[PDB]
Amino acid sequence: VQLVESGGGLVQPGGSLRLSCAASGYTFTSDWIHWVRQAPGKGLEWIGEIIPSYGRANYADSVKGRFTISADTSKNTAYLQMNSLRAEDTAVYYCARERGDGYFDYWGQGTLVTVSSASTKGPSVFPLAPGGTAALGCLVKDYFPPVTVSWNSGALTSGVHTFPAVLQSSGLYSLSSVVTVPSSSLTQTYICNVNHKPSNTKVDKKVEP
Amino acid sequence: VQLVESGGGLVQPGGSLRLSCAASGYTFTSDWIHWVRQAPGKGLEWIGEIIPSYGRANYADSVKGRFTISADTSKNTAYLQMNSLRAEDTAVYYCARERGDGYFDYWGQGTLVTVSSASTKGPSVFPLAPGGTAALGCLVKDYFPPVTVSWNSGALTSGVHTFPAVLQSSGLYSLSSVVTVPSSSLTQTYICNVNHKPSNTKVDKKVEP
Amino acid sequence: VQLVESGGGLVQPGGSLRLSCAASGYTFTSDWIHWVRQAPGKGLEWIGEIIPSYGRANYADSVKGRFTISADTSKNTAYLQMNSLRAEDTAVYYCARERGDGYFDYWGQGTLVTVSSASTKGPSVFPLAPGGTAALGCLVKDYFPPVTVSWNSGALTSGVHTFPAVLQSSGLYSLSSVVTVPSSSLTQTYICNVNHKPSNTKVDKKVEP
Amino acid sequence: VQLVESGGGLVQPGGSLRLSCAASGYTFTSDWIHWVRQAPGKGLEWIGEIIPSYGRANYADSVKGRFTISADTSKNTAYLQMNSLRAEDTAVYYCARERGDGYFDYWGQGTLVTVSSASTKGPSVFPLAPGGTAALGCLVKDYFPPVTVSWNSGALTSGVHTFPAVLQSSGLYSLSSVVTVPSSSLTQTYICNVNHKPSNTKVDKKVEP
Amino acid sequence: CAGAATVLLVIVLLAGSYLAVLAERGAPGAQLITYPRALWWSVVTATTVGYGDLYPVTLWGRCVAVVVMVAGITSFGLVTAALATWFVGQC
Amino acid sequence: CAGAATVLLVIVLLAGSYLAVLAERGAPGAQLITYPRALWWSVVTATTVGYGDLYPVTLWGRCVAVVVMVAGITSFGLVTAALATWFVGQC
Amino acid sequence: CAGAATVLLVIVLLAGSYLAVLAERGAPGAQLITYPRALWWSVVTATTVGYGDLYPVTLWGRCVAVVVMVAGITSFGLVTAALATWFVGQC
Amino acid sequence: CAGAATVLLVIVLLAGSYLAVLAERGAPGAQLITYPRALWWSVVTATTVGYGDLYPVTLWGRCVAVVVMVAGITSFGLVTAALATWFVGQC
Amino acid sequence: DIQMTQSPSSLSASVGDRVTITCRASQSIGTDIHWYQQKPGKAPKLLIKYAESISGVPSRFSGSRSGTDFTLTISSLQPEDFATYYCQQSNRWPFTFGQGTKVEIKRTVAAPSVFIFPPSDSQLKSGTASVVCLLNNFYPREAKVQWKVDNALQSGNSQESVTEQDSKDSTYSLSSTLTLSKADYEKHKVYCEVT
Amino acid sequence: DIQMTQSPSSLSASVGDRVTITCRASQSIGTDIHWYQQKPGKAPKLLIKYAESISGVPSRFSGSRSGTDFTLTISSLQPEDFATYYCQQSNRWPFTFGQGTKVEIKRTVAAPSVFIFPPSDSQLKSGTASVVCLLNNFYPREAKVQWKVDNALQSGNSQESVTEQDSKDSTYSLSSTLTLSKADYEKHKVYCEVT
Amino acid sequence: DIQMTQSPSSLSASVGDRVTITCRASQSIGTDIHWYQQKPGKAPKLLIKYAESISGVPSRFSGSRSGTDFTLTISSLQPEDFATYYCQQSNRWPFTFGQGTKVEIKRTVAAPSVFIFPPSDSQLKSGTASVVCLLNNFYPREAKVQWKVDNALQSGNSQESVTEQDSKDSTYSLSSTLTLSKADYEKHKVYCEVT
Amino acid sequence: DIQMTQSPSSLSASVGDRVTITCRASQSIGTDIHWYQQKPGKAPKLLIKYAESISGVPSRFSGSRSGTDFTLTISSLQPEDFATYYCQQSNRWPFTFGQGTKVEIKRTVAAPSVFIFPPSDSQLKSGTASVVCLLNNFYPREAKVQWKVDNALQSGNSQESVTEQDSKDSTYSLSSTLTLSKADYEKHKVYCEVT
């Protein structure tokens, strides 16, 4: 039993965007799917609830009657229609099951909905190269908006410090993915895998000294 | 469905005066007609209520048992008997329908009841005369107490700025009715119509340069 | 319908004393007789209540279980047994009818219960003598404890100013009963009548110039 | 009807210890035995309750689910299982009967449970010797942890001032048991009886000048 | 018979509700002063349930309340026996 | 029969109301201490409605309350069946 | 018959409880917004007891409340007569 | 018969009261935690009156409450019909 | 217990003026507060009940408002209204009264009719020499009566008393007494100069 | 009684901006508060009920929240929204209204079209000499119109009036009057310099 | 949880005087508070229940009042009343007790019977030299016992203990101990001057 | 609406220590508050319900007390407990969460393993010259990494990032970046001295 969210990335102020909570596991008649939110480094914001059964869907005065919540028992999903979007709506949006007991038993991965009048961009990706344990990394430079980084297609994971995104003075998320490795391996494939849903990227960069 | 008030102008301190709310539209068995008030530039004052049905008529401690509220289902009216009047009672008095739901669905025009020991008077009426848009006006000088001003018997209405009444150092409401007009018209009839219910006036003044 | 109290004058600290509320007028089954008190120039002190019917008799934590309230439907009376008396109990004690409605419809004259370790005394009585309206009076000197003064055995009452009792530096209530009279009467009997229940006095003093 | 406690003396921080409330007198079906506590010179601490009937046993958030309360209607007892003990648990532990009325009708003698990482010790016992009334005493020196002192095996009791235990700069309870006696008796047996449950002592010391 | 009983009840409820708001307005701090809520009051009373959100503070109110009790309990009882037979005579 | 029942009830109500204010006065913070309001209490109880503005804080009170329940529910029930027949035998 | 009645009741209770939390959520300060507590509500109502911890603030709620009363009082009454015979026909 | 019914009821009341205080103690802020007051609770419930001074906050409590309702309403109803006949067969 | 806080204690309002007296209960007490006029020396007299009017009570007396603030108003203060006014809980056991509010009628500066009185012969034998000095039907209360004998000032054994306002003239009489050792009073007797 | 405290009194918010008006009730009043637009000289108009929308009310007007804090919001302020907004209890008897909140529309500094007016001949006979001076469709309100005659300054008998904001231009007309003794007005007539 | 705040902590009231002890509950707790006398070393003893009296409890002990303020009073304080007094919630789960109030009996300045004690021979071998000094049945508590040896003052290893007030004499014994290295105690032994 | 006030925001408590987190509800909310562990980047995880324990939740986690003050306690803080902790109303509509409380694990001063990185050739063509400088698995957080080039100090285009505490080592990596115009970076390249 787990919840799988779809949609959401970047919109323009006043835009529109539609979030999805596919059900995927033992699902009772009368559950509310709920919608919660967290701004950059903020608390959690109860926003809505909906019984997919009778399809009645209560909202926050905070989020008004700007957003609509849709049901569809035929797809065992629920959806977060998102009109009239504001700089504040900038946040992550977790759905959640609540059985009528009034706590959140399970929680959808949660997606990032970003809201600014600036445009999408693309990561440069510029590699860092290097006894004991030596450290090699890469940069994902000058991007916008939600950046993934796995080493060797997710194989290597240990001593790996993929940092938080700095807001470049320019206006562009330049990160810095890092790995610690024993020095004897440079032998060993080391190719850092950048993904962006907002800019259809797949850039992999090789690390030799 | 609308409410039509009668009566009320000027009394002497300690005087008496009787206000009227003729019904005039689809009127149910069990409505309360209510009485609300607004002093010069003040808030609204719930004062009373009355079921014309059983004729029971509740009042404000603020307005005591100085005022009585009368019913008369035969005239589909209700009335605001007004004994022992005080400098404070100086106000406008809106009636209102309330269906037992406890908000005011409709509202009588509301009248002015004034209370001072000074006497009624009469307006002098002294015209102001004057390319593009030129402006002509008139004064309603040295009056007491509630002054009406329409141009051409209500025909002309645009660019018309009939001001608020200033309290003349004397003790007499001298106003100043104003109109903006294109200059090519002085051709055009321009005669400003002053009414007073408290002093049976009808004075109309003609405007040539 | 009126209530008539008996008893009460002076006791020694820790003494005992018994107050009486004879009924005297249309008296229902189920009335509470109550006991209220007022210290010299203080508020009123609810103290007790009693249904003479079942004879259950509630008291103030303030007056503890020091005082008992007795019933006696056979004498249509009620009584205020008064043990363990304190300097504070110094007060006047009104009884009162309360029908179970919880206000006091009628009120017994109320008596004075005084509490000090000093002893009873006796009034000297020393007359003051004197055109228009001239004024003649008398003094009731060096007394203890509740002093009555009527002129001519209660006949004359007008222009009469029988003062409040001053606490003499000695420790003895010396008052000053006063009358205003037209001067032509000194002709006219003028003899001021001092009573004391605590010292069996009846002293009457004659006023010539 | 009275309650008799067993167990409890000294444990090491994080230790365990089990207290006993043998019933001993007319004992109804449905009484709660309760557990109360008092730190050195502190207030009383409600800690638990248990119906020996259904054996349900509620505790203080203050004492967590660190302690368990056991029932045993077959021994008409109840018990205070005491895991995970802290410097604070240092206290005396009274049990008490409560009939479901919610006050404590009877009270077990109460025992001392001490909690420190220091070890048990033993009292030196060093006598003090001395007309009118002369005074003779003894010391119970350098002990740990709950010290008893009776004169002549509990025979003599009068003018006897067995002091409170001082915490010696060392870390060891050195007391001072004292008696006043008329001087003519030194004739008279005077031998002060020190008991310790924590160190199996029975030391009696004789007093000659 | 049963439709008479319902009506009687739906009368009593509409009667009481009416009189209550009437009975109650004027009394500062009266709650029971709008027909809508005066209705809920009047139901909850005739059902002998007694939630307590609402009740008369005034004498005249309570006098209403009594009739509402007397008339409305009985007349509701009817609709309660009514549907008690209907399930009886059936299954 | 029915007039006997009403009377019985109007007795119980006047009984209970009486005893309650009696039972209750003295207990600091007693509400149920004036016959008028002790009456409303006594009605609301016998109707099995239970508003909760009012109730006994004292033991003796509640002892009253019980009789008032026992006697007053039954004796009210009578007046409830009474008018249930009267609408039955008629329509 | 009696097992039908219980079920009917245990239906009404599960019906009402359901609809109430549904009816009530969204209304700021609604209490009666979780099925568990919406159940307690629904029992306490059908028993005509009326504790008052809980009740509908919303219209739609109260509309629920009414059905719950109407259906649930009767259907409970059945289980109340049910066990009233069972003690009668026995002793 | 009727003496059986009273006893049954006076059992249920003593049953419920017992279990309630048991059911309830431990729950911080439980009111319904001393047999005396747990009794008043248990009466007021079986009478279907519902004052609301007192009630269970705990689940297990309410589970008690239900039995107390079910058993106690019926068994009280008996004592209510009992004295309803006794006044009937007499006057 | 329940705490009626009457407001204020003192009112110096002028006759025929609008007079209002406040009683803040500590909790909501329903409508169960009653008013009580009590005049110097007399029993409380109940004016208002249920915050409702009693047989024989004058029309000026009405009592309003609710919550915690209860109001007894005298529309048009009268000369016969000089009294203390009391406030009574009924809601909770036991009943309580308010601290009480004294009303004093205001009116036009008057003066005193004054009347000095040498001491009774009979009293002069006794040993004390009580010189009285009467001051009749004045307003305001504030009055400075000294003594001098042979025109040096007397702060020795001066005992002022003042009376309750007349129930019709809302005036004030005073009686300054001056007690003297007979053989201080024989030394000099040429005698109360008021201001 | 029940005390709706509306918040704030004054709002100078710009057209198409988000506007919000608070009503703190003194106790919990259920959902029983209603909103009322009332425009200068006109009757209250009910906007929101039960804190619910009325037939014909514009979509910008919604009313939310609960407990003690009730909120009427204008999402996108309009030119026709210059009004005072009112707040009404229903929960307890009697009904109450809030102090009221005035909205003033903000917009671009404009200027006045000005129009001085010598006094009517007919009026000059009477004995007074009322010089008017018109100032049309300006923003903000703040305006300093003096008089000088023969270029010494006039603080004598200057009477300013200002009009209610236009329901479409959210502008302000003023009318400074200057009353003169005819035989002070005959002495000198060369005439209202605005700043 | 529920917060009984007993008031005050300490009472130095004189025997046969009127003594009163306050327990403010945090909420209204019905009448469900009980009193408990507990004497130094002994178990609580229940005095009052339901705020009602227990079999065997002395008549001086009564407990009154309600709301949040509960009062246990000792009309006439006794010598056997030196104790700490406790206060117990029942209304809500779980039960709670009050901080407790210690009563100290007041009486007439007395003095000490004093009794210095050289150290047990057996103990002198051990290595320490415990000089005791007894002070019997005094009042007040405040007492200044120093040591000097050869008439230079001792602030070294002075250990005072004081006893609980007698249950009949409401008096105080002290026992100042002075521990010495045997070979500081052999150096000089001419010995506790009290003030 | 209902206002859960969690207390405090920040906790720097040491592993295996007793950790406690407070949630004051604005009104009594029954027992209807739930706890939620949420770890950097992950969804809330429900720890406690009804203030009751969930399948799979570690034993250290218990949640107590009532009224307005609710408490989630970690008896023995763990390395895997570095998270933010949340608090959820259920009593009234709508649900609410607490401000949240961040726990930071304390442990022994360590140091950084440091690793400076010259800019990717491919990037030098582009036009910027991003010098990185890595600082691995340190404690505390406080670290002062400057730059100098040719030993004059650099406050130009220094961009520090710090990582979330390891879920096992409760340590901190930093990555100071320094962006340079390629033709400021060609002028001088002899290079991040940490303190």
Side-chain angles (χ1 to χ4, degrees), chain L residues 6-27:
Chain L
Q6 278 188 221
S7 189
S9 56
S10 211
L11 303 171
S12 258
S14 202
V15 39
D17 293 0
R18 209 200 151 178
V19 148
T20 119
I21 285 165
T22 333
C23 220
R24 219 138 324 164
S26 52
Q27 31 158 240

Side-chain angles (χ1 to χ4, degrees), chain A residues 34 36 38 42-46 49 58-61 94 98-105 107-109 126-130 133-137 139 141-142 159 161-166 168-169 174-176 178-180 205, chain L residues 1 32 34 36 38 41-46 49-50 84 86 88-90 93-99 115-120 122-123 126 128 130 132 134-137 157 159-164 166 173-175 177 179:
Chain A
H34 285 228
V36 176
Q38 203 187 164
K42 298 296 142 239
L44 300 181
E45 156 143 3
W46 186 77
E49 68 196 338
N58 305 320
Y59 306 85
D61 328 333
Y94 315 87
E98 179 265 322
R99 309 180 233 161
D101 48 14
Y103 54 84
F104 305 126
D105 82 30
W107 297 81
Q109 90 261 10
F126 284 126
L128 309 166
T133 25
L136 71 80
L139 286 130
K141 266 221 80 201
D142 298 310
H161 290 348
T162 294
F163 277 89
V166 157
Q168 252 286 56
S169 42
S174 96
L175 282 66
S176 283
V178 161
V179 197
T180 304
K205 285 299 189 165
Chain L
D1 257 338
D32 279 282
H34 315 290
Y36 288 97
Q38 183 209 243
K42 299 284 170 212
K45 185 170 206 171
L46 161 62
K49 58 191 247 188
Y50 296 113
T84 248
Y86 278 121
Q88 183 239 138
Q89 130 83 179
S90 103
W93 199 94
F95 301 165
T96 66
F97 297 105
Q99 282 91 62
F115 279 102
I116 189 157
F117 279 119
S120 338
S122 25
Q123 195 231 340
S126 166
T128 34
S130 271
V132 154
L134 223 211
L135 256 87
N136 266 32
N137 298 99
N157 263 288
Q159 4 149 7
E160 289 189 347
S161 167
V162 154
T163 38
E164 296 306 293
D166 292 62
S173 295
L174 178 133
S175 48
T177 321
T179 285

Side-chain angles (χ1 to χ4, degrees), chain L residues 56-70:
Chain L
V57 174
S59 45
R60 335 175 291 260
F61 294 138
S62 47
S64 103
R65 250 224 295 241
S66 240
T68 58
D69 285 53
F70 301 75

